[PDB]
Structure formats: structure tokens, C-alpha cells
Amino acid sequence: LPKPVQDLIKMIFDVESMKKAMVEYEIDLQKMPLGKLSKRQIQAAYSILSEVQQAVSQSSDSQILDLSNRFYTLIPHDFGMKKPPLLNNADSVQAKVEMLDNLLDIEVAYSLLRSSKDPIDVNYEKLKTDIKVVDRDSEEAEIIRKYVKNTHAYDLEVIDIFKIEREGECQRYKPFKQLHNRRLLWHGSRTTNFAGILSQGLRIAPPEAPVTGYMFGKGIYFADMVSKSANYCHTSQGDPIGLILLGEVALGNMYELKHASHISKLPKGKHSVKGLGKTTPDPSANISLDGVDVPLGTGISSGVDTSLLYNEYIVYDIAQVNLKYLLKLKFNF
Amino acid sequence: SIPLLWLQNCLIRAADDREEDGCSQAVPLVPLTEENEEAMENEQFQQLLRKLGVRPPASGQETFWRIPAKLSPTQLRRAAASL
Structure with a gap:
């Protein structure tokens, strides 16, 4: 395959890149490695966000707290020395939905990655x-x-x-x-x-x-x-x-x-x-x-x-x- | 009746296309008018669509109903002639 295509394949299937993206989203890589990301978990996380959506349009501090804890349990974050932010309004719903969109795509990429030929050709073919x-x-x-x-x-x-x-x-x-x-x-x-x-x-x-x-x-x-x-x-x-x-x-x-x-x-x-x-x-x-x-x-x-x-x-x-x-x-x- | 006639023509064109091409793909029903779209959102009409063999949109990813690729020119022509 032409050099630019080879370079394209390498950069999109870059595992270290996927990790850094996750870290950028404050995901706890140690508590949830790239390899344990699953479609099931992301689907359930989306559903929790839809529960936050409904709670917000109606909702108390303690059911907000529990939904937030449910979300973070499913998708562990690393907030360092900060208290974990509650999912309290539309802004947090949008921010988490966007991150899940990206996690979903990262899970698809890593699932594709799971000496017949060059690793480059194999990955290209997977696309x-x-x-x-x-x-x-x-x-x-x-x-x-x-x-x-x-x-x-x-x-x-x-x-x-x-x-x-x-x-x-x-x-x-x-x-x-x-x-x-x-x-x-x-x-x-x-x-x-x-x-x-x-x-x-x-x-x-x-x-x-x-x-x-x-x-x-x-x-x-x-x-x-x-x-x-x-x-x-x-x-x-x-x-x-x-x-x-x-x-x-x-x-x-x-x-x-x-x-x-x-x-x-x-x-x-x-x-x-x-x-x-x-x-x-x-x-x-x-x-x-x-x-x-x-x-x-x-x-x-x-x-x-x-x-x-x-x-x-x-x-x-x-x-x-x-x-x-x-x-x-x-x-x- | 205007939506019914549009449906009939969709079925027949899909029949013609499959017969001519020799291979068949799923075809969306793409309403171009509000009234026809309104028909597509109607429970009665949808029940008619399901009997003729038209599949509802896939959850999440689609809004248009689809004429499944499996339906032969003959089945499509029969469905069209039936109403």
C-alpha cells in the first residue's frame, strides 16, 4: 500500500492514542483499561444519562447524587483531588453524551484490533x-x-x-x-x-x-x-x-x-x-x-x-x- | 389514496429496478410531501405496510421504512396490485 495510506492506518489504529483520548476525558485508565471498554457498559451509561435528562426536567439532590454515582461506577473517572462532579444539569448531560460518543468509537476501533501479512495490510482490510x-x-x-x-x-x-x-x-x-x-x-x-x-x-x-x-x-x-x-x-x-x-x-x-x-x-x-x-x-x-x-x-x-x-x-x-x-x-x- | 398511489408506484418501480438490475437492495420509502409522511406515521397505514412486506426503520439509525431486498419483482407486483 502507498506510504500515505500506511501512515493513515497506523495513526487511526494507534492504541496509545486511544488511551490518551480516554485520559483526556478524565477516565480512570487503571480502573478501566482500554481493553475492558464494552458496548454493553456504554449503552447502559447512555441510559443513565437519559435518566439524568428526565430527572433534570422534573428533582432532588440525592437522586442526582445516586445517578451520578451510578454513572461513575459504570464509567470510572479520575478526578484527582476534586470531589466527583454531580450530573446536575443539561450541560453535564451534553458533556457526558459527547464523551460516550467518542468512547463508543474507540471501543469499535479496539475491537477491530481484536504472520500472514504485514500488520498494516491486515488492519487496512479490517476497515x-x-x-x-x-x-x-x-x-x-x-x-x-x-x-x-x-x-x-x-x-x-x-x-x-x-x-x-x-x-x-x-x-x-x-x-x-x-x-x-x-x-x-x-x-x-x-x-x-x-x-x-x-x-x-x-x-x-x-x-x-x-x-x-x-x-x-x-x-x-x-x-x-x-x-x-x-x-x-x-x-x-x-x-x-x-x-x-x-x-x-x-x-x-x-x-x-x-x-x-x-x-x-x-x-x-x-x-x-x-x-x-x-x-x-x-x-x-x-x-x-x-x-x-x-x-x-x-x-x-x-x-x-x-x-x-x-x-x-x-x-x-x-x-x-x-x-x-x-x-x-x-x-x- | 394519494399516499396509497405513491406506495403502489414505489412498489412497482422497485419491482422494475430489481428485475432490470438483476440484483436487489433494500429501498427506502422516501416521502417527499407532508401528507405522504403523515400517512407513514399513521397506525392503519403502517399495518398495511407490514402486511405488504415493508419493514419499519431500524431503531436509532433510520427513519425511513424499507422495501426489503428479499422481495422479488413478483411479490412486489402482487403487493401493488392488491391495493
Whole structure:
């Protein structure tokens, strides 16, 4: 396999990376090693958060205390010399739901890892994804670099562009090509999540995850500006490399919102949410790639009363998404 | 009746596609209008959908009902002709 692909495989299956991510979430690695992370436990933790969600909307200090203790028993944290924080409001529900989302992806990665061939090839094969290097001189790479440059504290450099095709996903997405308003959009995530994302695709938080834990409810989230999505890479000076997806999203009829709304179900006739931002790619410079809009205009004022800085796009059925590209980006601070 | 006719056409197009392609995939029923979506959320209509062989969305990950890949062009055509 081409060197960039080999490097891609190594970095997403990096076990030390998964551990550091967990530590960053204040998880007690000694009390719960990477190897004992389980789907069952994460599912039950989500359910506790849904109990906190319900308690909050009605609730006493002592049932808050017990739910909190139930949560931390299931997912041991290390709070050092601090009292363990109670799960007392929507803020704590969101913070824990986001961490569980990441734990879930880390568990999927480690489960994939569980001398026929190179370890690199074996792990690549576990992803059930065709990954090809996009030639830096292609029209493809040019468009994608423009999309990055134009919709950009850090400044962004594209290191590698990969064309990706997940097994089965073209067929799954195909009927939605009948659906109008298809857009090429950004989805950022932590590097420790991408083994899970390539093997299973982008997924929605489960039924037992609390709906109030997600700004627009439980769906799959995208941006039309790379700097919005770059925030979800959670990169740092100490480690200035992030990964970001380009996906074609069949948006259909957009339910347009100006504030957070914990949607359980779209209004009849709607197929996605668009969160309306203060800033938007200049609509003038949109291009169409076989019926797919690419909003690679530089950011102008949208003229919209909103609390959002950037547009967001959310769909609520997983088949509405087709991953097209994975970019390795350098964050230069 | 408008939702019924939309359903019928969905079944027939899935029949045509499977027959032409030679391999079959699950097909979402994708309502484009509020009224048709309203039909999809109706208990009666859903009961009709289940008898014809249409599967409800998978928990958590899906909202659209699906025409299972197992259904042959013949089964689909029969279901369509039945209402």
C-alpha cells in the first residue's frame, strides 16, 4: 500500500492514542483499561444519562447524587483531588453524551484490533474501505484545496487527500441520489474515531442516548466551512495533525433553524435540519459536480436573528450520507 | 389514496429496478410531501405496510421504512396490485 495510506492506518489504529483520548476525558485508565471498554457498559451509561435528562426536567439532590454515582461506577473517572462532579444539569448531560460518543468509537476501533501479512495490510482490510491517494495535481485535489482554503488561530494545510469508498455504502446511498439538494460537506472528528467511522460509517447516537445531549438532536452533523468542522478534530500544538471527512449528503427539504433544538423527529416533509449561521460560503461561487453542490466560496455575511456562527447540516437517517474523501490536515499554530 | 398511489408506484418501480438490475437492495420509502409522511406515521397505514412486506426503520439509525431486498419483482407486483 502507498506510504500515505500506511501512515493513515497506523495513526487511526494507534492504541496509545486511544488511551490518551480516554485520559483526556478524565477516565480512570487503571480502573478501566482500554481493553475492558464494552458496548454493553456504554449503552447502559447512555441510559443513565437519559435518566439524568428526565430527572433534570422534573428533582432532588440525592437522586442526582445516586445517578451520578451510578454513572461513575459504570464509567470510572479520575478526578484527582476534586470531589466527583454531580450530573446536575443539561450541560453535564451534553458533556457526558459527547464523551460516550467518542468512547463508543474507540471501543469499535479496539475491537477491530481484536504472520500472514504485514500488520498494516491486515488492519487496512479490517476497515472494509477502499482508500486511494488522490493525486495532488488532479482537478479533484484542486477543488478540495480551494474548499479548504476559502472556508478557512490556526491556519490550515492539506497534507494528504484520500478517496474513500466504504463497502456497501454506494448501494445504500444510491436511492437518495433521487433526492434533491445534495451537498458535499465537512465532517470533522477525533483521529481515534476514524477506524470506527470507516468500518461502520457515520452513525447516529442510540435510542438510549439522551436527545438533550445533542444541539439538534440525534442525527449526523456536517458543516459547509472547514474551520467549523476543524474544531471537532480537537487538535493541539503538541500534536498538530487532524483528519476530516468530505461527504455527499442528500439533504432534501431542509428544516431551517436559528437556535439549538433537540429534535426527536423532523416535521412532516422535511429531510434534514439546516442551522443558519452568521457566516456562509459566498453562494455566488458555488459549483455543481454532477448535481452535487460544493459551496467553496469564501465566507461572507449571511444576513440572517441567529445564535450560530456557521451553518450546520443534520440528517437523521444514516443512509443519507456517502463518504467521499478523507483529508489529513496540518494545523499550524 | 394519494399516499396509497405513491406506495403502489414505489412498489412497482422497485419491482422494475430489481428485475432490470438483476440484483436487489433494500429501498427506502422516501416521502417527499407532508401528507405522504403523515400517512407513514399513521397506525392503519403502517399495518398495511407490514402486511405488504415493508419493514419499519431500524431503531436509532433510520427513519425511513424499507422495501426489503428479499422481495422479488413478483411479490412486489402482487403487493401493488392488491391495493
